Amino acid sequence: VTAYEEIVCQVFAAVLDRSDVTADADFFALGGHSLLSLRVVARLRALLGVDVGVRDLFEAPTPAALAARLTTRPAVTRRGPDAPPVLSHFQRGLWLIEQVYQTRGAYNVPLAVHVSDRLDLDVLRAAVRDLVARHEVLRTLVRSSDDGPDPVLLAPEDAAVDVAEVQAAGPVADLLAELTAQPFDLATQIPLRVRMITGEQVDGCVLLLVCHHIAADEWSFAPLLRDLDTAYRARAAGRAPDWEPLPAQYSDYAATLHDWLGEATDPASPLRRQLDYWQHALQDLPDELDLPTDRPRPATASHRGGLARAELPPELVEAVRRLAAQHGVTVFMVVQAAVAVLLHRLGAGDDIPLGSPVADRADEAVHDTVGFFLNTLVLRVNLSGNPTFADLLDRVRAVDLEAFARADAPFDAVVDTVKPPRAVSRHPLFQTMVSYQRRPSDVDRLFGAATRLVEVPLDTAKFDLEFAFIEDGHGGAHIALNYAADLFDHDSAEQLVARLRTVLEHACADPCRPV
Ligand SMILES: *P(=O)(O)OCC(C)(C)[C@@H](O)C(=O)NCCC(=O)NCCS
């Protein structure tokens, strides 16, 4: 759970009166001392509701280390040569949504970088090979058996990488979306595909990485670009990249997680314990919410979608951060509360279940590596009683901290335990997702050129609605709404995401007004 790390950063920043607090900055090196350590502990106890002590801060003086400590489950260890691949339960759920609900390429994740230079295709191909050699998860196939899916780790010399140039014919943003949507056959193809887009209207090139989600979450963007940059620069100079072996492969992480999780039939295992919480917490859940769609739910889901964006003025982004600090919540919690208000005002009622991904990256061996570490949680917020926005923030905090203490039970096991009525055109337990994302910083000079990330207007959709508050890595932010085209017209989606901005604006202006 990254939320613990954000709060520790937030408390460090307020106590130290510093705005340059990063997850690996040492409290005392930043100007902390015993007197201020009392304030850090008191604030953390007040915001997290757990027993925090000076001993924790002394022994774990960085936000990443302290967040891992307050949570902690065994550390991830390398299993060594010829340890067999292990498919994680999170990977299992992704393979399974796609097999069962036939999501086409909706779970492909794009990473697009405009480059001022056209890159060398043969050098790029060599660098992708190095990248795949480094990260086993990028060359692990998934094959169907009659027990479930089996991983198949390809040796680096047997991994056939797919790197190609594509001439742009029309608007590049549409082409990026179409390339992103092409489905993978994970039984025969590695889950990474690379395209360099060139054309008359393109100055330089657009480098597009398409991963299947089974191999990467959005926190993988930073190591992916970092390692690809290193391999490209080395191969352009005629040599193999000079890197240090990974502290762990994804299979090392998966093996540790599964051994800690235990079995569902063991009443003392963390899995059964967290499953029992979720069975209680999701009792009498709505099958779906009463959303203002342009069309009723079809019998068959097409997974077509669009993407509507709402730009946020810098002033509003700071007001949202200020509101979060002032009420002792994360930016995600504010956005979550705002989405709940929006849906509530549109007639969805007082019981609002919102899905949200949660990253399992606290362990230092995987904190900054490539892979899919997201579990999905149902955050059930209640809006009965005419609460103010400040009231709702307290409610959302409590709901989220309870859920975060129980974030290892795989979502597919939660759905199985809760046993909702199933329908191929409705995602179970929730149909609106909310997340916070933050794009990599210092990715403006990759490959020896001038570079910048470009967002991709997805042609697909996973749910009815997916809201994302996305920070761009250099101060800016926008809200992205990935909506199901079966339910919403694009102009309705533009209105919805503008309304979410209005809720946020009203909330910062006066949090004491009633929802
Ligand atoms: P933190 O580790 O920054 O704490 C500093 C301290 C309070 C431990 C230290 O500055 C301090 O005052 N230690 C006590 C010194 C002492 O007991 N001498 C008194 C002679 S009776």
378: its two tokens: 């149902």
Task: Compute, in angstroms, the gap from residue 27 CA to the centroid of ligand 1.
Answer: 19
Spatial neighbors of 178 by CB under 8 A, at least 6 apart, are 459
Dist. CA 417–CA 513, nearest whole Å:
39
For a mutational test of ligand 1's pocket, the pick from 34, 35, 54, i.e. the residue with the most ligand atoms closer than 8 A to its C-beta, is 34
Supply the residue whose CA is at minimum distance from atom 9 of ligand 1: 34
Residue 34: DSSP 8-state: H
Task: Compute, in angstroms, the gap from residue 37 CA to the centroid of ligand 1.
Answer: 14
Q: Is 356 exposed, middle or buried (0-12, 13-18, 19+ CB in 10 A)?
A: buried
Q: DSSP string covering 387-443, please?
A: -BHHHHHHHHHHHHHHHHTT--S-HHHHHHHH-PPPBTTB-SS-SEEEEEEEPPSS-
- Give the experimental resolution in Å: 2.0
CB 331 within 8 A of CB 320: yes
Residue 245: DSSP 8-state: P
Domain 89-250 of CATH type 3.40.50.300: no
Rg (the chain; Cα; Å): 23
Task: Compute, in angstroms, the gap from residue 247 CA to the centroid of ligand 1.
Answer: 39
Dist. CA 432–CA 49, nearest whole Å:
28
What are the backbone angles phi and psi of residue 328, rounded to the nearest 5°?
65, 45
409: its two tokens: 């039970």
Q: Is 356 annotated as a binding residue?
A: no
> 10 Å Cβ neighbour count for 237?
8
Q: Answer yes or no: is the C-beta of 34 below 6 A from any ligand 1 atom.
A: yes
CB 445 within 8 A of CB 451: yes
* Residue 365: CA count within 13 A, CB half-sphere: 18
Dist. CA 191–CA 162, nearest whole Å:
10
Spatial neighbors of 304 by CB under 8 A, at least 6 apart, are 459, 460, 461, 484, 485, 486
> 10 Å Cβ neighbour count for 422?
10
Spatial neighbors of 164 by CB under 8 A, at least 6 apart, are 121, 194, 195, 196
Dist. CA 427–CA 464, nearest whole Å:
8
What are the backbone angles phi and psi of residue 170, rounded to the nearest 5°?
-130, -145
Supply the residue whose CA is at minimum distance from atom 1 of ligand 1: 34
Name where the chain breaks: residue before each gap, C-N > 2.5 Å.
72
Q: Answer yes or no: is the C-beta of 35 below 6 A from any ligand 1 atom.
A: no
**Which residues pair with residue 471 across a beta bridge?**
438, 477
Q: Which CATH architecture has domain 2-72?
A: Orthogonal Bundle (1.10)
Dist. CA 255–CA 266, nearest whole Å:
18
Phi-psi sector, 60: left (phi>0), alpha (psi -120 to 50), beta: beta
Task: Compute, in angstroms, the gap from residue 34 CA to the centroid of ligand 1.
Answer: 9
- Give the DSSP H/E element, type plus range, for residue 293: none
Supply the residue whose CA is at minimum distance from atom 3 of ligand 1: 34
Spatial neighbors of 491 by CB under 8 A, at least 6 apart, are none
Dist. CA 409–CA 286, nearest whole Å:
21
Counting from 1 in the atom list of ligand 1, the atom nearest the Cα of 28 is 3
Give the full edge-to-edge strand order of the sheet including 451-454: 162-167, 192-198, 205-212, 108-115, 451-454
Per the listing, tokens 């993978």 go with 184
**Which residues pair with residue 451 across a beta bridge?**
115
Task: Compute, in angstroms, the gap from residue 54 CA to the centroid of ligand 1.
Answer: 15
15: its two tokens: 């106590």
Q: Are strands 192-198 and 205-212 parallel, antiparallel or unpaired?
A: antiparallel
179: its two tokens: 């390339």
